[PDB]
Design a binder for this molecule. Structure first.
Ligand SMILES: O=C(O)CCCC[C@@H]1SC[C@@H]2NC(=O)N[C@@H]21
Ligand SMILES: O=C(O)CCCC[C@@H]1SC[C@@H]2NC(=O)N[C@@H]21
Ligand SMILES: O=C(O)CCCC[C@@H]1SC[C@@H]2NC(=O)N[C@@H]21
Ligand SMILES: O=C(O)CCCC[C@@H]1SC[C@@H]2NC(=O)N[C@@H]21
Ligand SMILES: [Cl-]
Ligand SMILES: [Cl-]
Ligand SMILES: [Cl-]
Ligand SMILES: [Cl-]
Lengths: 123, 123, 123, 123
């Protein structure tokens, strides 16, 4: 049920856009558009998720990587996100990330709805 | 020159084995075998690297993900590594990692030679 | 102006309570009460902050440590928080933390007002 | 036995010097001299450790903070270290750290002996 839940479009607290297809055998493929930093437009992402998550109602483990080179620019950097997908009406991906240029750390919360402009200003 | 340098087999300070092919447009694909934790044999990895790194002699940014499910076992977890490839006679990948089951953090140093059994015992 | 701004009581997104006095020469002393984990009541904290922060309107760097032993219990663990104090009407301390038992990572946002019960349920 | 083991002088893999007294009730006080970054001479540190660690032979949890202002300079930054003290003939403090200016992450291994000049060059 993780494949159906994960596949689609996600927005983090900054308004960045995470577009992902979850493959049957645990592949993540898609694009990432960061609302911040030395980035513009979409970047290729790839990653992995647990395609047979535990039937005890907990989260699905996943992670992905973006190297910050596209046709617009090259930041000479890469970010990995590591976290858990939880489904339901308020579906979320809770992540910690590492950005290497020298490794910055932080956390991103992704949901299926764009956060309000006021919340984007706050976070 | 990053593609030629990255592609191949890497060992971390724990004796884990990282087998990777760097694709021309920035893809990382391969297998990971962890010497520790709830893991055995090889796991699929995918990731990204900067395929046009800066010509100022610094490192190449990269990252990859392993979800810890294979035909032997499923740990219901995923690790991302984020770091820099530096080439030369003592080529290295310096990484920080995030393991999500609840996110553990650490650091792995990968080289082209297996560390000595005595160093593996130490680290 | 950092001393006046920092000294007082702070609540994170989980409803944990951070009570701190900022000393003139950069000392942080006080108590921490975690709303979660293997903890109850208040624990001694100590830390440091930049007592002469830059006059360019940016944040004040700080960090503190709690070892999770008090008169109620001992979790045999310790957390450090590292982050920035920003003042004003919506004063905040943005932190990343490391909990060592084996090091967990996360992020806590502290403000001068308790988050709503509904937000505490969410975060 | 943690108090006796911790108190003293420690060197990390970079040759930085960590001088600490462990207090009876779990206080850490001392100085830190970083071999790298925007730092020179010694900086005040304070932190906490588990003063009644588990009798099952495992590590002692601890953490400390340095704000990077002294009489020589002010970097407008602060680092926290979080980790475990293990005693014996090859006594060590294994740490992860967070440096906030915007939070960098890494790991430091401290021992009672200075690493060789050749190892300092490597790490
Ligand atoms: O500045 C760079 O080097 C590239 C852009 C990085 C943007 C980071 S990645 C982590 C965080 N989450 C986001 O959606 N954007 C920032
Ligand atoms: O225990 C698990 O959940 C799966 C195995 C995780 C092994 C970790 S990943 C980070 C670190 N580096 C390694 O080579 N192995 C450990
Ligand atoms: O479980 C333990 O070992 C002690 C309690 C730890 C609580 C953590 S510390 C980081 C995070 N922020 C909080 O306010 N509480 C949790
Ligand atoms: O550059 C600064 O802002 C102050 C110096 C920071 C030095 C860091 S702290 C973590 C790491 N471990 C060390 O011994 N030094 C570096
Ligand atoms: Cl797949
Ligand atoms: Cl490619
Ligand atoms: Cl003071
Ligand atoms: Cl004490």
């Amino acid at each position: 049920a993780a494949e159906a839940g994960i596949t689609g479009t996600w927005y983090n607290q900054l308004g960045s856009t995470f577009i992902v297809t979850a493959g049957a055998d645990g592949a993540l493929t898609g694009t990432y558009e960061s609302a911040v930093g030395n980035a513009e437009s979409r970047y290729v992402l790839t990653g992995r998720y647990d395609s047979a998550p535990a039937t005890d109602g907990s989260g699905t483990a996943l992670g992905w990587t973006v190297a910050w080179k596209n046709n617009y620019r090259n930041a000479h950097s890469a970010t990995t996100w590591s976290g858990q997908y939880v489904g339901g009406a308020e579906a979320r991906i809770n992540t910690q990330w590492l950005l290497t240029s020298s490794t910055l750390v932080g956390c991103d919360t992704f949901t299926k709805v764009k956060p309000s402009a006021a919340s984007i200003d706050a976070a």
